[PDB]
């Protein structure tokens, strides 16, 4: 619910590194910005 760049600003990572991180850590971060 935030542009891939705005995401990087809020997430503190890159689109590249995120796509490399485990699918769980990915979904975890998405949900964490929400409420887990």
Curated annotation (Swiss-Prot):
Belongs to the villin/gelsolin family. Associates (via C-terminus) with F-actin. Interacts with SCARF1. Interacts with PLCE1. Interacts with ACTR2 and ACTR3; associates with the ARP2/3 complex. It comes from the Eukaryota. Most highly expressed in the small intestine and colonic lining. Weaker expression also detected in the thymus, prostate, testes and uterus. Expressed in podocytes (at protein level). This is Advillin. The chain holds residues 784 to 819 of 819 of the full protein. It is found in: Cytoplasm, Cytoskeleton; Cell projection, Lamellipodium; Cell junction, Focal adhesion; Cell projection, Neuron projection. The gene is AVIL. It comes from Homo sapiens (Human). It is linked to Nephrotic syndrome 21: A form of nephrotic syndrome, a renal disease clinically characterized by severe proteinuria, resulting in complications such as hypoalbuminemia, hyperlipidemia and edema. Kidney biopsies show non-specific histologic changes such as focal segmental glomerulosclerosis and diffuse mesangial proliferation. Some affected individuals have an inherited steroid-resistant form that progresses to end-stage renal failure. NPHS21 is an autosomal recessive, rapidly progressive, steroid-resistant form characterized by onset of kidney dysfunction in the first year of life. Signal peptide: none annotated. Coiled coil: none annotated. Ca(2+)-regulated actin-binding protein which plays an important role in actin bundling. May have a unique function in the morphogenesis of neuronal cells which form ganglia. Required for SREC1-mediated regulation of neurite-like outgrowth. Plays a role in regenerative sensory axon outgrowth and remodeling processes after peripheral injury in neonates. Involved in the formation of long fine actin-containing filopodia-like structures in fibroblast. Plays a role in ciliogenesis.
